[PDB]
Amino acid sequence: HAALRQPQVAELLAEARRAFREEFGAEPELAVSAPGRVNLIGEHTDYNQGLVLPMALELMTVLVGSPRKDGLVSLLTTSEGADEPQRLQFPLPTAQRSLEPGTPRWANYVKGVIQYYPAAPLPGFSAVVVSSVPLGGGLSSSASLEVATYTFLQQLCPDSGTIAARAQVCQQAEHSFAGMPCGIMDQFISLMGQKGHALLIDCRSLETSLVPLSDPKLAVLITNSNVRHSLASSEYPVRRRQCEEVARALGAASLREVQLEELEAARDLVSKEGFRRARHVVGEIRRTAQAAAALRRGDYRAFGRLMVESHRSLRDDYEVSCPELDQLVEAALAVPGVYGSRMTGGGFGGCTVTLLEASAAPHAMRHIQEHYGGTATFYLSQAADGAKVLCL
Ligand SMILES: O=C1CCCC2=C1C1(CCCCC1)N=C(Nc1nc3ccccc3o1)N2
Numbered sequence: 001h002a003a004l005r006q007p008q009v010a011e012l013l014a015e016a017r018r019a020f021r022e023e024f025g026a027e028p029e030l031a032v033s034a035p036g037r038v039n040l041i042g043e044h045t046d047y048n049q050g051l052v053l054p055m056a057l058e059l060m061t062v063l064v065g066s067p068r069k070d071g072l073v074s075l076l077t078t079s080e081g082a083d084e085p086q087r088l089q090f091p092l093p094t095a096q097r098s099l100e101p102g103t104p105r106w107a108n109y110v111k112g113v114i115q116y117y118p119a120a121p122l123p124g125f126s127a128v129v130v131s132s133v134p135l136g137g138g139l140s141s142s143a144s145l146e147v148a149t150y151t152f153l154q155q156l157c158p159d160s161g162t163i164a165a166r167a168q169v170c171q172q173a174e175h176s177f178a179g180m181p182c183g184i185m186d187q188f189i190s191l192m193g194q195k196g197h198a199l200l201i202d203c204r205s206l207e208t209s210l211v212p213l214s215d216p217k218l219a220v221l222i223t224n225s226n227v228r229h230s231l232a233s234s235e236y237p238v239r240r241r242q243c244e245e246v247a248r249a250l251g252a253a254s255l256r257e258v259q260l261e262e263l264e265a266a267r268d269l270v271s272k273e274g275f276r277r278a279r280h281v282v283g284e285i286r287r288t289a290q291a292a293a294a295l296r297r298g299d300y301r302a303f304g305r306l307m308v309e310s311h312r313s314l315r316d317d318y319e320v321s322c323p324e325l326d327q328l329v330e331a332a333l334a335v336p337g338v339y340g341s342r343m344t345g346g347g348f349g350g351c352t353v354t355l356l357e358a359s360a361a362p363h364a365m366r367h368i369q370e371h372y373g374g375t376a377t378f379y380l381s382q383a384a385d386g387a388k389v390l391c392l
């Protein structure tokens, strides 16, 4: 019932720097960071061209490296949880021979970003990878690794594209090298985060808006269920198809174009669970617009209520909660000073997010833990910077 330390960039950096020196016999030339994420509200909307309101965490991936002359890529990760081996070397992709997902799985993320990197000529490089983002724990550790990799390659071989195109490359790596067909939110927030802000993302227009979240009276408590059901992986793609089925049945580019009234009128053009999937999305888009407006005018009680409606919608209509997350959310809404709690991320495990009076965090942590059938982990996180570069 104490909050896990968030190592500052400097401490992850020093760790990365020391391990690079030992491994490659020289100081690294380059450092980059990319954070993980919590979604405050707007879940399972990004791939429906909806609205999301994520914020970057102090939990981050740091990559320190140097270009090579031999066209080789040599990687080391110190991340506990990374599958063996911790080291991998491979030649750069060419027109002849492209890179290929396999073992270790953590290198599929670097390989994917290298494979789809849009600028040339890319030299080889040596790199060490460290992360405080818990691996597969629901706060976008993969997006953080992809975005750190992309930022690194930018120093090796500057691209000339938009932040969206960069997000879309990281997203391509996730799809093609990790078999997770994600939307754009995780990569976009990892790129675009700013200290003291949430980011409202319009996943149709790709327009972004920085929204202040820096009030000392207020905290964001992230709770890790420290569970992941296999459905986290297998049912993600299923929901994407169900949403597509419903958009096609109504003659709509995306569920962004569909309102509840339009959806209710067409009940008999779609399945029962179809209709439930689409009721959540339409409702979550509306709620994210309302949450954004609420947050701007300091109305945390309204924000929290919209967080609770998002969870109920995800529980009952989208059916991507599990008993573990449900227990954690119920626990948190019992604590005075808590404005709202919901599951965040894909679901079927991972984290919940709780907006509360800062004074209440310790009482929330004790109570959530005591009421939770597993062992919860806690992060108290302010809104953090997106991808960053430090010349060494
Ligand atoms: O097995 C899964 C399925 C669900 C999502 C999750 C993966 C694994 C695959 C490799 C071993 C740990 C779990 N890793 C990530 N993310 C991540 N692994 C990293 C390694 C170093 C630095 C940053 C990293 O971010 N995502």
Ligand SMILES: OC[C@H]1O[C@@H](O)[C@H](O)[C@@H](O)[C@H]1O
Residues within 6 Å of the ligand: 039, 042, 043, 044, 045, 046, 047, 182, 183, 184, 185, 186, 345, 346, 347
């Ligand atoms: O809100 C649900 C989210 O699930 C995420 O974990 C996925 O990577 C995102 O792109 C988004 O779809």
